[PDB]
Amino acid sequence: KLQSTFVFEEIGRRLKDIGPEVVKKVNAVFEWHITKGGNIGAKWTIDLKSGSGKVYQGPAKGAADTTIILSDEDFMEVVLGKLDPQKAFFSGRLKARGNIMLSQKLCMILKDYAKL
Ligand SMILES: COCCOCCOCCOc1ccc(C(C)(C)CC(C)(C)C)cc1
Ligand SMILES: [Cu+2]
């Protein structure tokens, strides 16, 4: 059981409401590899390229623009504000592949949706 699952499911619920506005600012597809034992326990895609966006399990149906790899616990610590994702990147706990420049847009945008 991964705690990250609750977050991804809630994100999916959120996008059915704020999706269209999130997809216009981001315009990208994000893949997530959540580890538990250095072992990938779950893969998630957050597609923000059309409509209201979508969250689904597994690898991206097409190319992912950015892939983020981190532990279940570290993901949760970033979600709860206890671990800065940029510090985690420079420390080696958070890995990012692909277009790392796109990673900025995502946190900032949903956060601003976390204050409404
Ligand atoms: C151009 O960037 C310079 C290098 O900095 C890299 C920073 O990388 C950290 C940002 O990547 C993340 C990591 C996690 C997240 C969260 C977990 C907040 C996204 C979420 C809540 C939608 C899962 C967002 C962006
Ligand atoms: Cu920033």
Side-chain angles (χ1 to χ4, degrees), residues 11 32 46 75 78 85-86 89-90 94 100-101 103 106-107:
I11 289 161
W32 301 80
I46 309 182
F75 177 94
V78 165
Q86 277 171 117
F89 176 83
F90 294 117
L94 186 162
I100 179 74
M101 256 168 101
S103 320
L106 190 50
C107 90

Side-chain angles (χ1 to χ4, degrees), residues 18-89:
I18 69 158
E21 289 68 53
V22 173
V23 168
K24 296 156 63 176
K25 295 142 109 163
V26 178
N27 198 5
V29 174
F30 296 88
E31 194 171 288
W32 301 80
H33 298 174
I34 307 302
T35 62
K36 190 83 183 301
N39 195 295
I40 300 182
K43 286 193 181 178
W44 290 83
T45 306
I46 309 182
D47 180 314
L48 302 174
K49 237 199 158 197
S50 63
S52 50
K54 173 185 199 199
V55 176
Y56 58 93
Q57 305 188 94
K61 300 146 175 197
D65 293 286
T66 310
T67 311
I68 298 142
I69 311 95
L70 73 179
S71 72
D72 195 45
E73 256 272 4
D74 282 344
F75 177 94
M76 302 303 312
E77 295 193 15
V78 165
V79 165
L80 294 163
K82 302 190 55 63
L83 175 61
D84 182 298
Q86 277 171 117
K87 298 181 195 217
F89 176 83

